[PDB]
Design a protein around this ligand. Structure first.
Ligand SMILES: Nc1ncnc2c1ncn2[C@@H]1O[C@H](COP(=O)(O)OP(=O)(O)O)[C@@H](O)[C@H]1O
Ligand SMILES: CC[C@@H](O[P@@](=O)(OP(=O)(O)O)[C@@H](C)N)C(=O)O
Ligand SMILES: [Mg+2]
Ligand SMILES: [Mg+2]
Ligand SMILES: [Mg+2]
Length: 306
């Protein structure tokens, strides 16, 4: 009441349906929690008059460019309205798998070997000497859109001959793409809440990689929380997650995907400043384990709104 909360759902990313699913759930969650929440789809309502509508706070239940980079946040900040996660810089940093990577590697964080390509270097004919780059990475390699979420445009390329196409795709989603070494080890994600870190979740997709279908439309996907990892490696995780996180400048709430390599080490894949909150999403899982309910999480997330 008075404190009319706005849950920004959908928008126009490639993640819009997931977004809409998050919003619907956070909307419920905030309402069970006793907050006057509102479905504000930026794909209709001009989020600029958000100030004019009487909202006192905003819940970013949006995923991707338009909603997860520093764009909206910049607005909100100038409007004078608090929002739920990572500031302007940590939102723009996180959304760039390419820049998030150089900063992490910059600070000596365990980042996977990559090779960036732009679309312009792409429609030219990458040096038959730029493959020297890419093939010194090994086989396979996973090619991905720089600024995407929910495993969009990603394509595993086993063999140099399967790359050109892996790239056409990734490229239909961005002009800067990262080609990286395939990590042969379990897949992990850690969730941050305030300055706390929820129990670790080990994902086990029944496919090749935690693809789009695996993340949302699949029941084969196995979820282990915590990781059932030894208290050594477990300590190494949080440690690394928080490092890679403060290095980014992120706050309030977020989630980091890491995976193991044949080397025994942890490799930061990427970071998320507006994580999913669907009936399949990871944050929600991390929290229930930490004995919280969906309205406690979503509500605690708002308590952090700045
Ligand atoms: N280096 C890698 N080796 C193997 N699989 C990888 C690698 N990087 C990412 N993947 C797979 O791709 C998925 C999406 O990777 P991620 O970088 O988190 O992108 P997104 O923004 O789509 O969430 C990961 O959950 C993992 O399943
Ligand atoms: C199940 C995967 C996860 O999705 P995201 O938060 O992370 P991701 O980019 O690695 O997929 C997603 C909504 N961007 C989620 O909803 O829990
Ligand atoms: Mg991101
Ligand atoms: Mg992502
Ligand atoms: Mg991921």
């Amino acid at each position: 009441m008075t404190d009319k909360i706005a849950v920004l759902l959908g928008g126009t990313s490639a993640e819009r349906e997931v977004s809409l699913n998050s919003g619907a759930a956070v909307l419920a969650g905030l309402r069970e929690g006793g907050i006057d929440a509102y479905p504000v789809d930026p794909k209709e309502v001009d989020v600029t008059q958000l100030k004019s509508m009487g909202f006192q706070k905003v819940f970013i239940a949006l995923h991707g460019r338009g909603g997860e980079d520093g764009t909206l946040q910049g607005m909100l900040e100038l409007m004078g309205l608090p929002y739920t996660g990572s500031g302007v810089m940590a939102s723009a940093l996180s959304m760039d798998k390419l820049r998030s990577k150089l900063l992490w590697q910059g600070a000596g964080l365990p980042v996977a070997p990559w090779v960036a390509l732009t679309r312009a270097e792409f429609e030219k004919g990458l040096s038959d000497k730029q493959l020297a780059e890419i093939s010194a990475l090994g086989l396979p390699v996973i090619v991905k859109p720089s600024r995407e979420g929910s495993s969009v445009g990603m394509s595993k390329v086993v063999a140099e001959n399967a790359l050109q196409d892996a790239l056409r795709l990734a490229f239909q989603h961005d002009e800067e793409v990262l080609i990286e070494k395939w990590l042969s080890g379990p897949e992990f994600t850690v969730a941050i809440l305030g300055e706390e870190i929820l129990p670790s979740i080990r994902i086990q997709p029944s496919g090749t990689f935690y693809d789009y279908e695996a993340k949302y439309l699949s029941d084969e996907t196995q979820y282990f929380c915590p990781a059932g990892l030894e208290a050594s490696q477990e300590a190494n995780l949080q440690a690394l997650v928080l490092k890679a996180w403060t290095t980014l400048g992120c706050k309030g709430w977020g989630r980091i995907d890491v995976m193991l390599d044949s080397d025994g080490q942890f490799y930061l894949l990427e970071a998320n400043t507006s994580p999913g909150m669907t009936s399949h999403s990871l944050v929600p899982m991390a929290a229930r384990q930490a004995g919280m309910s969906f309205s406690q999480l979503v509500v605690r997330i708002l308590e952090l709104a700045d």
